[PDB]
C-alpha cells in the first residue's frame, strides 16, 4: 500500500498539491527510511524532499502528516553529520521545537527524538538547538508530580534527548543550560526504569567530565549517594555509567573525592575490582588510582575498606590494560602514603606481582613500577629494613628483571634500574 514505493512516486505524490496524496507519499517515504538495511537517506535528500517535509511539520490540521514527516526527518537526521545537516539546513529545529507543545503525545515524542538526533551530532548543533529555545519546553514535559504517570517510552526518549544536550565538549554545554537541566536530571536519576537510570547516569557522566567547577555544579546537587547506590546495581548498563561518573568526580578536588568516600563508594569496590566485565574492572582500578592520589586520610580509608588485597589481585591477574592502571594506583599510593601505609603494601603481597610485570614491554609501566619500588625502599630505610626488602626482591627474582632493564631503549628505565641496583 505504502510499501516499497519508488522515490519517483514519492516525489510525484509530495508535489501533487493534494494534502492527502502528500500524506501517503510521506508515509511511503517514512517506511523506506525505517528500513534497517541501508535506508535510502541520500536518495531522499537528493530528491529535494527535506523542505517539503519541514513544511509538513507545520500542518496543524493534518496531524498524521506532521507525525509521518517528523518520523522521516528523524531518520534522515539519524544518519551521518552531512545528513543531519541537511535536516537542520531545511529549517527543522524551530519547527520541531514548536511541535514539543503538540497535544498529540506521539507527535511531541517524535519531535523530542528528532531534536535528540540533531543535538547528538555535536556541540555546534547541540548549542544551536539550545539557542532556538529547546530546553524550556522539553523540561515542561517532565514537570509532573510523579514521573511514573508518563508513558515509559516517552520518558526514555525525553531522558535520552536531555542526555544529548549534556553531551560533548569543546565547548561543554553552556553553564546556564546545565543549571537549568540539572534539577530535572536529578529527578530522572531517582526513577525506577533501568533505561531512564542508565541514560541519566550517562548524562551526569558527561557533566562531570570536565573542570572541577563542572564537577562541583553536579556534586552540590547531592547526586553522589544515588550514584553510589546505582554503582551497586545488577544491570551493567547502569553500573557502567554510574562508575564513569564516580570516576570523573574523583578527578576533582580532595574534597570532592571525599564526598564519594563519605557516601560509601569504597565498600562497592570488592565487587567492582573482581567484576567479570573487563571494562568495569579497568574503570574501577582507574578510579582507585585517583583515590590513592588523594590525602593520607583518604589512603587510610582505602586500607580500612580492605582494598589493598584487591589491588594485589589485579596486579596478579587481570587484563593487561587493568594491570597498568593497578600499577598507577600503587605508584600513587607509595608517593603519598605514610611509612606505615607503604609497609602494609608489602605485607599484603605487592612485591611479587609487581616484579612479574617488569617483564612487560610498555615502557611506561616499567617507569611506574620502578617509581613505586623506589618509594617503597625509601620507606624501608626510614625503618632500617632495606636489606629485608632487597632479599624479597631477590627471592622472587626481581633483581634479575631489574638488572636486564638497564638494557632498555628509554634510558630513564636504564637510569632508574641501575640506580636501584646501586643503593640496594
Amino acid at each position: 500500500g505504502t510499501v516499497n514505493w519508488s522515490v519517483e512516486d514519492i516525489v510525484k505524490g509530495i508535489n501533487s498539491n493534494n494534502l492527502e496524496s502528500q500524506l501517503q507519499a510521506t508515509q511511503a517515504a517514512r517506511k523506506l527510511l525505517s528500513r534497517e538495511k541501508q535506508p535510502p537517506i541520500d536518495n531522499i535528500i537528493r530528491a529535494g524532499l527535506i523542505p517539503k517535509f519541514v513544511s509538513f511539520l507545520g500542518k496543524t490540521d493534518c496531524s498524521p502528516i506532521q507525525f509521518e514527516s517528523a518520523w522521516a526527518l528523524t531518520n534522515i537526521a539519524s544518519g551521518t553529520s552531512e545528513q543531519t545537516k541537511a535536516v537542520v539546513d531545511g529549517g527543522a529545529i524551530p519547527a520541531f521545537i514548536s511541535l514539543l507543545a503538540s497535544p498529540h503525545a506521539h507527535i511531541s515524542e517524535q519531535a523530542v527524538w528528532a531534536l535528540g538526533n540533531i543535538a547528538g551530532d555535536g556541540s555546534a548543533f547541540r548549542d544551536l538547538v539550545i539557542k532556538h529555545g529547546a530546553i524550556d519546553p522539553l523540561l515542561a514535559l517532565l514537570a509532573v508530580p510523579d514521573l511514573s504517570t508518563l508513558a515509559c517510552g516517552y520518558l526514555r526518549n525525553l531522558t535520552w534527548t536531555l542526555s544529548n544536550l549534556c553531551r560533548n565538549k569543546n565547548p561543554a554545554p553552556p553553564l546556564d543550560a546545565v543549571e537549568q537541566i540539572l534539577p530535572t536530571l536529578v529527578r530522572l536519576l531517582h526513577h525506577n526504569d533501568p533505561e531512564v537510570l542508565a541514560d541519566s547516569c550517562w548524562a551526569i557522566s558527561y557533566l562531570t567530565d570536565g573542570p572541577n567547577e563542572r564537577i562541583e555544579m553536579v556534586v552540590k546537587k547531592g547526586v553522589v549517594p544515588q550514584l553510589v547506590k546505582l554503582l551497586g546495581a545488577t544491570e551493567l548498563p547502569i553500573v557502567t555509567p554510574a562508575l564513569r561518573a564516580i570516576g570523573n568526580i574523583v578527578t576533582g578536588t580532595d574534597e570532592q573525592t571525599q564526598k564519594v568516600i563519605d557516601a560509601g563508594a569504597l565498600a562497592v569496590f570488592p565487587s567492582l575490582l573482581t567484576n567479570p566485565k573487563t571494562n568495569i574492572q579497568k574503570e574501577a582500578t582507574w578510579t582507585m588510582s585517583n583515590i590513592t592520589a588523594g590525602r593520607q586520610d583518604q589512603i587510610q580509608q582505602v586500607v580500612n575498606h580492605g582494598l589493598v588485597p584487591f589491588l594485589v589481585g589485579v596486579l596478579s591477574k587481570a587484563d593487561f590494560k587493568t594491570q597498568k592502571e593497578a600499577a598507577w594506583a600503587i605508584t600513587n599510593y607509595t608517593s603519598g602514603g605514610t611509612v606505615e601505609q607503604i609497609v602494609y603494601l608489602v605485607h599484603c603481597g605487592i612485591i611479587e606481582p609487581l616484579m612479574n610485570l617488569l617483564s612487560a614491554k610498555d615502557t611506561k609501566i616499567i617507569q611506574v613500577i620502578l617509581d613505586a619500588i623506589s618509594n617503597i625502599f625509601q620507606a624501608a630505610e626510614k625503618l632500617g629494613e632495606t636489606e629485608k626488602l632487597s632479599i624479597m626482591i631477590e627471592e622472587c627474582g626481581g633483581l634479575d628483571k631489574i638488572e636486564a632493564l638497564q638494557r632498555h631503549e628509554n634510558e630513564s628505565v636504564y637510569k632508574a634500574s641501575l640506580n636501584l641496583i646501586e643503593k640496594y
Partner: peptide
C-alpha cells in the same frame, strides 16, 4: 551510548 537512533517501528 548511541549518539543517534533510527526509528524502525
Amino acid at each position: 551510548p548511541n549518539t543517534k537512533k533510527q526509528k524502525c517501528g
